[PDB]
């Protein structure tokens, strides 16, 4: 599924991301925009045999099990396929773990590079949440 910006903002608000560990809703929408373009089916195969999955491009070496990543862990206790579903519930739950375990959103390269120095509230402009 390709979410609209505001459809994703509303879903993320419902699932408790607004101000989660100090990150306003627009951070998470911005991160999704640049990580996946709002496509739940996005993947990125890395050279090291890991793959980034879903709307927040969550990596299989650490966070989910895809059964094909050498020397890996599954900290979210999920199959990576659950991160390709239209329903973002499991992706959000895992993203919350990433931001707890990492003491922030720096795990997301695209958020670091495109979001953190901007007015992230722009990503919520117009949205009925």
Author numbering: 1 to 129
Please give me the paper's original passages concerning this structure.
We have solved the crystal structures of two of the three isoforms of lysozyme purified from Pekin duck eggs (DEL-I and DEL-III). The duck egg lysozyme structures have the basic fold of the C-type lysozyme characteristic of HEL. In general, the duck isoforms contain approximately 20 amino-acid substitutions (of 129 positions) relative to the chicken enzyme, and were thus considered to be likely to maintain essentially the same fold.
When lysozyme from duck eggs was first analyzed, it was noted that the most striking differences between the enzymes from ducks and chickens, apart from ducks having multiple isoforms, were the complete absence of any histidine residues in the duck variants (which at one stage was incorrectly suspected of being a requisite for catalysis) and the increased amounts of arginine relative to the chicken counterpart. These findings have been verified by our structures of DEL-I and DEL-III. DEL-I and DEL-II also bound HyHEL10 with a similar affinity, which represented at least a three orders-of-magnitude decrease compared with HEL. In contrast, binding of HyHEL10 was essentially eliminated altogether in the case of DEL-III. Hence, the reason for the increased affinity noted for the K49T-substituted antibody is likely to be twofold: elimination of like positive charges that would otherwise be in close proximity and the provision of additional space on the surface of the antibody to accommodate the N93R substitution found on the surface of the duck enzymes. Additionally, as indicated by our binding data, one of the duck isoforms, DEL-III, failed to bind HyHEL10 with any substantial affinity.
